[PDB]
Amino acid sequence: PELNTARGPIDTADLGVTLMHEHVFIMTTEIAQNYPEAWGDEDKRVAGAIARLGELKARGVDTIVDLTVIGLGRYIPRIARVAAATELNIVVATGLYTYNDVPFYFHYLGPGAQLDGPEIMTDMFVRDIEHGIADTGIKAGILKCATDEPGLTPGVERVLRAVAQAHKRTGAPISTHTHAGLRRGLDQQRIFAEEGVDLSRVVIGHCGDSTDVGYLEELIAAGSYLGMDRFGVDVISPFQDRVNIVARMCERGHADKMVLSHDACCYFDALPEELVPVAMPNWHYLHIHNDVIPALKQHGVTDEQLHTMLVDNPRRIFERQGGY
Cβ at position 276, least distance to Zn ion in Å: 15
Q: Which of residues 1-30 bind Zn ion (CB under 5 A)?
A: none
Confirm or reject binding of residue 177 to Zn ion (CB under 5 A).
yes
**String of DSSP letters for 89-104:** EEEEEEEB--SSPPPG
CA separation for the pair 182, 254 (Å, rounded): 22
Residue 62, helix vs strand vs coil: coil
Build a one-symbol-per-residue string for 263-302: x at contacts with Zn ion by CB under 5 A, - elsewhere.
x---------------------------------------
Cβ at position 176, least distance to Zn ion in Å: 9
Q: Is 131 annotated as a binding residue?
A: no
Question: Please, which residue, 119 or 263, has the CB nearer to Zn ion?
Answer: 263
Q: Is 263 annotated as a binding residue?
A: yes
Cβ at position 259, least distance to Zn ion in Å: 13
Question: Please, which residue, 95 or 110, has the CB nearer to Zn ion?
Answer: 95
Q: Do 134 and 102 contact (CB within 8 A), yes or no?
A: no
**Cα–Cα–Cα angle for 296, 297, 301, nearest 5°?**
75
Residue nearest to Zn ion (CB): 177
Q: Is 284 annotated as a binding residue?
A: no
Q: Count Cβ neighbours within 10 Å for each residue of 98-109 and write b for 16 or more, e otherwise.
A: bbeebeeebeee
Q: Is 23 annotated as a binding residue?
A: yes
Cβ at position 256, least distance to Zn ion in Å: 23
Cβ at position 205, least distance to Zn ion in Å: 6
CA separation for the pair 233, 175 (Å, rounded): 19
Size of the site for Zn ion (CB under 5 A): 2
Segment holding 277, helix H or strand E: helix 276-279
User: Which residues precede a break in the chain, with C-to-N distance above 2.5 Å?
Assistant: none
- Rounded to 5 degrees, what are φ and ψ at 31? -70, -45
Q: Is 229 annotated as a binding residue?
A: no
Q: Which of residues 239-268 bind Zn ion (CB under 5 A)?
A: 263
Query: Given the rule CB under 5 A, which residues bind Zn ion?
Result: 177, 263
Binding-site residue numbers for Zn(2+) are: 21, 23, 144, 177, 206, 263
Binding-site residue numbers are: 21, 23, 144, 177, 206, 263
